[PDB]
Amino acid sequence: VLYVGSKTKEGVVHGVATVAEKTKEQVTNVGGAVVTGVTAVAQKTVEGAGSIAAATGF
Amino acid sequence: VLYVGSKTKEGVVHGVATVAEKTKEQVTNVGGAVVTGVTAVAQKTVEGAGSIAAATGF
Amino acid sequence: VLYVGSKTKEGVVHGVATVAEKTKEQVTNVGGAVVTGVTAVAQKTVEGAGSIAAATGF
Amino acid sequence: VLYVGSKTKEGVVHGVATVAEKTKEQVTNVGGAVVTGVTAVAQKTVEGAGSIAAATGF
Amino acid sequence: VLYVGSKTKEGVVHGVATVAEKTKEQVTNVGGAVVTGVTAVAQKTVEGAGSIAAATGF
Amino acid sequence: VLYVGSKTKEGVVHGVATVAEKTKEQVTNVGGAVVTGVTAVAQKTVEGAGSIAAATGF
């Protein structure tokens, strides 16, 4: 609301360093969501919002 | 509400260093959500919001 | 509410260093959520919000 | 000398995962060797060879 | 000398994952060797060879 | 000397993943060697050769 010289880092992912030799991601879905591999979602304010993998269904 | 020179880190993931040689992620879903692999979700305010893997169903 | 020069780390995951040689994540769901692998969720204020693996069902 | 399908790991360091918040390495030498911080030397055959910190002197 | 389908890892360092927030390496030498910070030397055959920090002197 | 279908990794460093926020390397030498920061030397055959920080002196 009122900052007088601060330093903020609200809602941050910092450093996802990753090392791999092989990678075989094998997804076969039908009617839903799938998210694989590296993922670095970063939000500050989520006002009743969705997931990172949503499946509403019927 | 009022900062007079502080230093804040509200809602942060910092450092997800990872080392691997092989990786075989094998998902076969039908009607739901799946999230695999490295994941670094980082939020500050979640006002009644979703998960990181939601399955609403019927 | 009022900081006069403090240093805060409210809601932080710091350091998830991980070392592996092989990895075989094998999920086969039908109607629910699944989350595997490294995961570093980090939140500050969760006002009656969701999980990191939700299954609402009927 | 003769391998017929084995799997060997001769001379290996595997996994030096390390987590720290601060680090202040303060060396002031004059006439010798100094080695600090993380170190993961890994050799197989050392035929009368040197150290990882040698000081021959006069 | 003779491999018939093996899998070898002779002389390997694998995985030096490291996480830090601050780092202040302060070296002031005069006449010798200094090595600091992360270091991942990896050799197979060292036939009477040097160190990773040598100081021959007079 | 004779490989008939093997898979070798002789003399390898694999994965030096590193995460830091600050870094202040402050070296003031006079007559010797200094090596700081991340370092991933990787050799196979060192036939009586040098170090990674040599100081011959007089």
Side-chain angles (χ1 to χ4, degrees):
Chain A
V1 182
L2 186 139
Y3 295 175
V4 188
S6 43
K7 162 167 152 36
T8 68
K9 287 190 65 170
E10 320 172 4
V12 54
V13 51
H14 160 48
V16 195
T18 303
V19 165
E21 175 166 321
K22 294 198 174 189
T23 296
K24 297 172 51 68
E25 309 179 25
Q26 184 163 348
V27 52
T28 82
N29 86 4
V30 169
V34 174
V35 51
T36 74
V38 185
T39 295
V41 180
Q43 315 166 299
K44 170 179 171 173
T45 306
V46 187
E47 294 286 346
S51 300
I52 68 169
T56 296
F58 299 95
Chain B
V1 182
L2 186 139
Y3 295 175
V4 188
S6 43
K7 162 167 152 36
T8 68
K9 287 190 65 170
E10 320 172 4
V12 54
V13 51
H14 160 48
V16 195
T18 303
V19 165
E21 175 166 321
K22 294 198 174 189
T23 296
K24 297 172 51 68
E25 309 179 25
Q26 184 163 348
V27 52
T28 82
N29 86 4
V30 169
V34 174
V35 51
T36 74
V38 185
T39 295
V41 180
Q43 315 166 299
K44 170 179 171 173
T45 306
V46 187
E47 294 286 346
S51 300
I52 67 169
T56 296
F58 299 95
Chain C
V1 182
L2 186 139
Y3 295 175
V4 188
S6 43
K7 162 167 152 36
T8 68
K9 287 190 65 170
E10 320 172 4
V12 54
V13 51
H14 160 48
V16 195
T18 303
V19 165
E21 175 166 321
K22 294 198 174 189
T23 296
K24 297 172 51 68
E25 309 179 25
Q26 184 162 348
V27 52
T28 82
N29 86 4
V30 169
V34 174
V35 51
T36 74
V38 185
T39 295
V41 180
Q43 315 166 299
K44 170 179 171 173
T45 306
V46 187
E47 294 286 346
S51 300
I52 68 169
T56 295
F58 299 95
Chain D
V1 182
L2 186 139
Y3 295 175
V4 188
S6 43
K7 162 167 152 36
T8 68
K9 287 190 65 170
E10 320 172 4
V12 54
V13 51
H14 160 48
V16 195
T18 303
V19 165
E21 175 166 321
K22 294 198 174 189
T23 296
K24 297 172 51 68
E25 309 179 25
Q26 184 163 348
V27 52
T28 82
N29 86 4
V30 169
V34 174
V35 51
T36 74
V38 185
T39 295
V41 180
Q43 315 166 299
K44 170 179 171 173
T45 306
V46 187
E47 294 286 346
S51 300
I52 68 169
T56 296
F58 300 95
Chain E
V1 182
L2 186 139
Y3 295 175
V4 188
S6 42
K7 162 167 152 36
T8 68
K9 287 190 65 170
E10 320 172 4
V12 54
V13 51
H14 160 48
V16 195
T18 303
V19 165
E21 175 166 321
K22 294 198 174 189
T23 296
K24 297 172 51 68
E25 309 179 25
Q26 184 162 348
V27 52
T28 82
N29 86 4
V30 169
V34 174
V35 51
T36 74
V38 185
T39 295
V41 180
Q43 315 166 299
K44 170 179 171 173
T45 306
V46 187
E47 294 286 346
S51 300
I52 68 169
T56 296
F58 299 95
Chain F
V1 182
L2 186 139
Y3 295 175
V4 188
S6 43
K7 162 167 152 36
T8 68
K9 287 190 65 170
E10 320 172 4
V12 54
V13 51
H14 160 48
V16 195
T18 303
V19 165
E21 175 166 321
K22 294 198 174 189
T23 296
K24 297 172 51 68
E25 309 179 25
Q26 184 163 348
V27 51
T28 82
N29 86 4
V30 169
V34 174
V35 51
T36 74
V38 185
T39 295
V41 180
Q43 315 166 299
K44 170 179 171 173
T45 306
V46 187
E47 294 285 346
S51 300
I52 67 169
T56 295
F58 299 95

XYZ file of all heavy atoms in Angstrom, chain D residues 28-54:
169
model
N 44.215 -15.933 3.357
C 45.362 -15.038 3.144
C 46.620 -15.882 3.343
O 47.119 -16.005 4.465
C 45.351 -13.840 4.091
O 45.890 -14.230 5.360
C 43.940 -13.298 4.294
N 47.136 -16.453 2.257
C 48.310 -17.304 2.347
C 49.569 -16.494 2.040
O 49.512 -15.304 1.724
C 48.142 -18.543 1.446
C 48.569 -18.331 -0.011
O 49.073 -17.286 -0.409
N 48.370 -19.365 -0.815
N 50.725 -17.150 2.138
C 51.987 -16.511 1.788
C 52.738 -17.349 0.763
O 53.071 -16.868 -0.326
C 52.853 -16.270 3.037
C 54.258 -15.860 2.632
C 52.222 -15.206 3.917
N 53.005 -18.610 1.097
C 53.829 -19.447 0.246
C 53.400 -20.897 0.163
O 54.228 -21.780 -0.079
N 52.107 -21.162 0.361
C 51.595 -22.512 0.278
C 50.265 -22.544 -0.447
O 49.702 -21.507 -0.803
N 49.771 -23.758 -0.654
C 48.523 -23.959 -1.371
C 47.345 -23.982 -0.407
O 47.457 -24.439 0.733
C 48.562 -25.259 -2.171
N 46.207 -23.482 -0.883
C 44.953 -23.505 -0.138
C 43.831 -23.804 -1.121
O 43.772 -23.208 -2.201
C 44.680 -22.173 0.591
C 43.301 -22.191 1.225
C 45.738 -21.903 1.643
N 42.945 -24.723 -0.751
C 41.761 -25.042 -1.538
C 40.565 -25.121 -0.599
O 40.571 -25.898 0.362
C 41.931 -26.342 -2.349
C 42.398 -27.481 -1.474
C 40.620 -26.716 -3.016
N 39.555 -24.293 -0.858
C 38.367 -24.246 -0.017
C 37.115 -24.445 -0.860
O 37.206 -24.761 -2.051
C 38.284 -22.920 0.743
O 37.893 -21.877 -0.158
C 39.625 -22.568 1.363
N 35.946 -24.262 -0.255
C 34.694 -24.452 -0.959
C 34.470 -25.905 -1.343
O 35.276 -26.792 -1.070
N 33.325 -26.139 -1.988
C 32.991 -27.482 -2.446
C 34.063 -27.968 -3.408
O 34.586 -27.200 -4.225
C 31.601 -27.490 -3.100
C 31.201 -28.905 -3.478
C 30.576 -26.876 -2.166
N 34.405 -29.250 -3.305
C 35.427 -29.858 -4.143
C 35.090 -31.328 -4.318
O 34.832 -32.027 -3.336
C 36.820 -29.694 -3.527
O 37.165 -28.305 -3.484
C 37.859 -30.439 -4.344
N 35.091 -31.794 -5.563
C 34.638 -33.138 -5.902
C 35.639 -33.829 -6.815
O 35.290 -34.365 -7.869
C 33.256 -33.094 -6.544
N 36.917 -33.802 -6.426
C 37.942 -34.515 -7.177
C 37.559 -35.983 -7.303
O 37.041 -36.595 -6.362
C 39.311 -34.352 -6.495
C 40.388 -35.100 -7.263
C 39.668 -32.884 -6.375
N 37.808 -36.554 -8.479
C 37.452 -37.945 -8.743
C 38.422 -38.494 -9.777
O 38.406 -38.061 -10.933
C 36.012 -38.061 -9.227
N 39.254 -39.444 -9.364
C 40.248 -40.051 -10.232
C 40.119 -41.566 -10.163
O 39.500 -42.115 -9.252
C 41.668 -39.623 -9.844
C 41.800 -38.136 -9.562
C 43.101 -37.786 -8.872
O 43.375 -38.253 -7.768
N 43.906 -36.954 -9.518
N 40.704 -42.241 -11.150
C 40.717 -43.697 -11.191
C 42.074 -44.284 -10.840
O 42.174 -45.114 -9.931
C 40.284 -44.199 -12.575
C 40.498 -45.691 -12.765
C 40.036 -46.161 -14.131
C 40.462 -47.598 -14.378
N 39.890 -48.141 -15.641
N 43.129 -43.873 -11.535
C 44.468 -44.409 -11.321
C 45.420 -43.252 -11.072
O 45.632 -42.419 -11.958
C 44.935 -45.234 -12.522
O 43.960 -46.240 -12.818
C 46.262 -45.900 -12.215
N 45.989 -43.204 -9.871
C 46.924 -42.148 -9.508
C 48.296 -42.774 -9.304
O 48.629 -43.227 -8.204
C 46.446 -41.403 -8.249
C 47.320 -40.208 -7.976
C 45.000 -40.979 -8.409
N 49.102 -42.801 -10.365
C 50.392 -43.496 -10.351
C 51.453 -42.569 -9.768
O 52.214 -41.910 -10.481
C 50.761 -43.966 -11.752
C 49.842 -45.037 -12.313
C 50.075 -46.397 -11.684
O 51.115 -46.576 -11.016
O 49.217 -47.287 -11.857
N 51.507 -42.535 -8.441
C 52.512 -41.733 -7.758
C 52.418 -40.258 -8.068
O 53.448 -39.594 -8.243
N 51.205 -39.724 -8.138
C 50.976 -38.353 -8.553
C 50.729 -37.460 -7.340
O 50.863 -37.877 -6.186
C 49.818 -38.294 -9.543
N 50.362 -36.210 -7.607
C 50.241 -35.210 -6.573
C 48.961 -35.312 -5.764
O 48.085 -36.145 -5.995
N 48.877 -34.426 -4.781
C 47.766 -34.319 -3.847
C 46.665 -33.459 -4.472
O 46.624 -33.275 -5.690
C 48.271 -33.759 -2.514
O 49.258 -34.607 -1.953
N 45.721 -32.985 -3.662
C 44.852 -31.884 -4.058
C 45.237 -30.587 -3.379
O 44.562 -29.567 -3.574
C 43.368 -32.200 -3.801
C 43.087 -32.285 -2.304
C 42.980 -33.502 -4.481
C 41.618 -32.339 -1.970
N 46.297 -30.594 -2.567
C 46.860 -29.364 -2.014
C 48.326 -29.661 -1.705
O 48.628 -30.285 -0.684
C 46.103 -28.909 -0.779
N 49.219 -29.220 -2.586
C 50.637 -29.533 -2.491
C 51.421 -28.314 -2.032
O 51.121 -27.184 -2.429
C 51.182 -30.024 -3.834
